[PDB]
């Protein structure tokens, strides 16, 4: 993480698709290094189909520059997350901030 910073690092991490941002808010049902399943809050949930938003994380893979692009889950089992919360760091992202 940058110890000295500006405050844009949150904005850069999320706006770039490298991180995984919550589609809808709720509580985490299942946490694996592979996937993340969020059980949606009722206000955010559509009446039909009920649902949960399932985020399939990108795992170890080749970048254009031959660097490694790998996602890691930043949340813990059964934790409240609201829509627009950082779900998983990408490469060079820490807890929603940008660590280069």
């Amino acid at each position: 993480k940058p110890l000295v910073g500006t405050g844009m690092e949150r904005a850069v991490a999320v706006d770039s698709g490298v991180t995984a941002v919550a589609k809808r808010g709720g509580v985490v049902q299942y946490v694996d290094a592979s996937r993340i399943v969020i059980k949606v809050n009722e206000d955010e949930m559509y009446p039909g189909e009920a649902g949960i938003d399932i985020y399939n994380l990108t795992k170890y893979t080749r970048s254009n520059q031959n660097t490694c692009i790998n996602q890691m889950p930043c949340v813990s089992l059964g934790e409240p997350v609201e829509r627009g919360d950082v779900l998983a760091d990408g490469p060079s992202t820490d807890l929603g901030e940008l660590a280069l």
């Binding site: 299942y30 946490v31 694996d32 290094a33 592979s34 795992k59 170890y60 790998n70 890691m72 889950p73 089992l77």
Partner: protein
């Protein structure tokens, strides 16, 4: 006229990690002459036993994901490099970790051995996310000196085939931080003599008195050649 030898006085333990040993009978300036020379040998060439080879269940290489664990295999390997243990009469031992069920897997869930002492049973190896998710692993721990990275550990080859044997980097060393401070100690009659307060920091796998002796051991052995000089070749 002639000289004076020192000795260790009170070795004051504070934490299993850190402690303050003290050496009272030091002549003029020898507190500095020793403290740095000891700091030198203290931080570097101290024996330690760090995990080396780890063979797990369903995993071919460190770049995979175990279904049912939120830690990537690479990250679990990294957690092991920081597992502090101590053995006694075995120079390498293989520990079997077994656990399942939702929850954290600490360093206390392993199988105890006669020489196994887990100095941090709370040390987190990885978490476990699904009711009936199960992990078995063979953890090969050896003892040695210095820093041996996993890369230099691939030249012997000669069929280390076991695709599932993931080497990790060897950190062998107990010492974390060494600091020495010399404050002037006056024994009632002598002009001026000094003390040595050596404040150290440890992973909890070595007691202060054992360490400082074997430290000093190497010194005279290196000075051995130094005394007479046979121009040897």
């Amino acid at each position: 006229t002639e000289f004076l030898k020192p000795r260790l006085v009170d070795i004051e333990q504070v934490s299993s990690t850190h402690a303050k040993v003290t050496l009272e009978p030091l002549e003029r300036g020898f507190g500095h002459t020793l403290g740095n020379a000891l700091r030198r040998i203290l931080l570097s060439s101290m024996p330690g036993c760090a995990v080396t080879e780890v063979e797990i269940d369903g995993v071919l290489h460190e770049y995979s994901t175990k279904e049912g664990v939120q830690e990537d295999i690479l990250e679990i390997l990294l957690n092991l490099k920081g597992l502090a243990v101590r053995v006694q009469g075995k120079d390498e031992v293989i520990l079997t970790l077994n656990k399942s069920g939702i929850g954290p897997v600490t360093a206390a869930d392993i199988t105890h051995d006669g020489d196994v002492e887990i100095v941090k049973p709370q040390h987190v190896i990885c978490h476990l996310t699904d009711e009936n998710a199960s992990i078995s692993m063979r953890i090969k721990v050896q003892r040695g000196r210095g820093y041996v990275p996993a890369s230099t550990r691939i030249h012997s080859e000669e069929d280390e085939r076991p695709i599932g044997r993931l080497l990790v980097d060897a950190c062998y060393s107990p010492v974390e931080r060494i600091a020495y401070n010399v404050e002037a100690a006056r024994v009632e009659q002598r002009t001026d003599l000094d003390k040595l307060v050596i404040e150290m920091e440890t992973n909890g796998t070595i007691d202060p008195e054992e360490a400082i002796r074997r430290a000093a051991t190497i010194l005279a052995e290196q000075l051995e050649a130094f005394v007479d000089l046979r121009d040897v070749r």
